[PDB]
Design an enzyme around this catalytic site. Sequence first.
Site, mmCIF file in Angstrom:
data_model
loop_
_atom_site.group_PDB
_atom_site.id
_atom_site.type_symbol
_atom_site.label_atom_id
_atom_site.label_comp_id
_atom_site.label_asym_id
_atom_site.label_seq_id
_atom_site.Cartn_x
_atom_site.Cartn_y
_atom_site.Cartn_z
ATOM 1 N N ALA A 1 11.411 6.303 1.782
ATOM 2 C CA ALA A 1 12.725 6.125 2.400
ATOM 3 C C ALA A 1 12.630 5.400 3.739
ATOM 4 O O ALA A 1 13.562 4.685 4.126
ATOM 5 C CB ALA A 1 13.409 7.480 2.585
ATOM 6 N N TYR A 2 11.505 5.559 4.444
ATOM 7 C CA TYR A 2 11.328 4.956 5.764
ATOM 8 C C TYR A 2 11.264 3.433 5.705
ATOM 9 O O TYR A 2 11.610 2.762 6.684
ATOM 10 C CB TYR A 2 10.047 5.492 6.407
ATOM 11 C CG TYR A 2 8.792 5.069 5.665
ATOM 12 C CD1 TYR A 2 8.174 3.851 5.937
ATOM 13 C CD2 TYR A 2 8.237 5.875 4.679
ATOM 14 C CE1 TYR A 2 7.044 3.451 5.252
ATOM 15 C CE2 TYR A 2 7.100 5.484 3.991
ATOM 16 C CZ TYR A 2 6.509 4.270 4.284
ATOM 17 O OH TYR A 2 5.380 3.873 3.605
ATOM 18 N N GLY A 3 10.804 2.880 4.594
ATOM 19 C CA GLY A 3 10.463 1.476 4.510
ATOM 20 C C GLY A 3 9.261 1.303 3.607
ATOM 21 O O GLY A 3 9.006 2.128 2.738
ATOM 22 N N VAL B 1 5.015 -0.491 3.430
ATOM 23 C CA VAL B 1 3.849 -0.931 4.186
ATOM 24 C C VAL B 1 3.015 -1.844 3.300
ATOM 25 O O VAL B 1 2.802 -1.541 2.121
ATOM 26 C CB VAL B 1 3.008 0.268 4.675
ATOM 27 C CG1 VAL B 1 1.755 -0.209 5.405
ATOM 28 C CG2 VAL B 1 3.842 1.172 5.575
ATOM 29 N N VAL C 1 0.805 -1.216 0.000
ATOM 30 C CA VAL C 1 0.000 0.000 0.000
ATOM 31 C C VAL C 1 0.840 1.268 0.000
ATOM 32 O O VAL C 1 0.315 2.335 -0.354
ATOM 33 C CB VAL C 1 -1.000 0.031 1.179
ATOM 34 C CG1 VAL C 1 -2.111 -0.985 0.973
ATOM 35 C CG2 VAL C 1 -0.298 -0.219 2.490
ATOM 36 N N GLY C 2 2.111 1.212 0.372
ATOM 37 C CA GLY C 2 2.932 2.405 0.366
ATOM 38 C C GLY C 2 4.382 2.082 0.632
ATOM 39 O O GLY C 2 4.714 1.043 1.212
ATOM 40 N N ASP D 1 1.489 9.949 13.698
ATOM 41 C CA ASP D 1 2.689 10.745 13.474
ATOM 42 C C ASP D 1 3.212 10.586 12.048
ATOM 43 O O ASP D 1 4.422 10.610 11.814
ATOM 44 C CB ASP D 1 3.766 10.411 14.508
ATOM 45 C CG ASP D 1 4.196 8.959 14.476
ATOM 46 O OD1 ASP D 1 3.425 8.097 14.003
ATOM 47 O OD2 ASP D 1 5.315 8.678 14.960
#
Length: 336
Positions: free
Chosen positions: A30-32, A34, A26-27, A164
């Site tokens: 840079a964070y990872g 999902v 789904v997404g 957040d």
Amino acid sequence: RPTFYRQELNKTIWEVPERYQNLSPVGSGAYGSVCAAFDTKTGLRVAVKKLSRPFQSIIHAKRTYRELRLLKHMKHENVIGLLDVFTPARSLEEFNDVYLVTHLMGADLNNIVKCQKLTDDHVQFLIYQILRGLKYIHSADIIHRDLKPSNLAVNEDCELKILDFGLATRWYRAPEIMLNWMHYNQTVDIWSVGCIMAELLTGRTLFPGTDHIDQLKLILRLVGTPGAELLKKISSESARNYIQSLTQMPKMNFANVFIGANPLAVDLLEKMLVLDSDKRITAAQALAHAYFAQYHDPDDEPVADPYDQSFESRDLLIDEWKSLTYDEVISFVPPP
Ligand SMILES: COc1ccc(OC)c(CCC(=O)Nc2cc(-c3c(-c4ccc(F)cc4)nc(/N=N/c4ccc(F)cc4)n3C)ccn2)c1
Ligand SMILES: CCCCCCCCO[C@@H]1O[C@H](CO)[C@@H](O)[C@H](O)[C@H]1O
Ligand SMILES: CCCCCCCCO[C@@H]1O[C@H](CO)[C@@H](O)[C@H](O)[C@H]1O
Ligand SMILES: CCCCCCCCO[C@@H]1O[C@H](CO)[C@@H](O)[C@H](O)[C@H]1O
């Protein structure tokens, strides 16, 4: 101890417990990345996040620890919470990947509003839940600092959660944040609530600035230029001299600005959208305001357990942050 399976998703091998079925991306960023999944053990649709580069550097490792500590601590109906955290690793020695699980969310506050006026009862319910969540967050001595509609998840029963992150803009920021003031009050978030509430009532962005200076210009037109009592608290020589050379502007008559709104809503906006952060209403005070009479329950607006944030001041090695993170994975207890 769960049996894991391995599947290629978002261009890496995901290894997850077999309870999580039907993974679908789904997404990512840079964070990872999902995936949506179905947790067969709870019957919940969930979001599974695989962190990217969680221990690549000291800063990455500390960020991973910070995120897990925060999500493990937040246990409130109106705040994102952690359903699960896992790693395929069987020991600290092979610990390289972190997966986080929460409720699958499919809509934020923008999706609910669609630039329309909401009914007053609807605004009461939404703002009530934001403030209930903020009372909890602030009681843990946490400040959100970038509260905005895209950080507010809302399901089909209009149940709201503070996030957040946004789901796969400076219009809501407190003016002191815009000015790099530091020493932030928890009421920076109350400013944001006032901006959100105003937009829900009118169907229009309250302060749609084109850039930083325009944002401040629009704010001062509504709330007026700083008064004498606020000016006494400004230590910056350059800020004072600039402020003193401004053409004074009175605070506008909020009752005339928000014509047709519930007068109790107008009263609450007047107490949230105050330039001086020391004079803004707190989340706990706002919950007791007469605007929320049909939702307020002083015995079901809980506060958080103390949140030890002393790690923020520490300068540790990668393997120390990694081991501390591993400890937090192992000790996780899933919620009821
Ligand atoms: C807008 O309407 C929609 C319509 C259809 C849709 O489907 C295509 C979607 C997308 C559904 C979705 O994305 N759903 C979702 C995501 C997360 C999640 C976690 C997450 C967090 C904790 C967990 F334990 C698990 C996941 N982390 C995240 N991003 N993190 C970020 C972000 C930005 C940064 F700069 C840094 C980090 N997100 C987006 C959690 C729960 N539901 C929307
Ligand atoms: C159709 C897909 C169903 C997936 C169910 C995953 C359940 C994952 O959990 C497993 O369930 C087993 C059921 O016999 C138990 O015996 C295992 O101990 C348990 O770990
Ligand atoms: C648990 C989710 C609600 C409380 C969030 C507290 C966040 C404290 O730190 C916040 O982290 C956010 C994500 O990096 C940033 O958007 C905020 O600017 C930062 O202040
Ligand atoms: C011209 C724009 C003026 C903006 C003035 C914003 C004043 C916000 O208020 C200030 O917040 C500080 C914490 O951040 C507190 O330390 C001060 O006591 C409080 O007055």
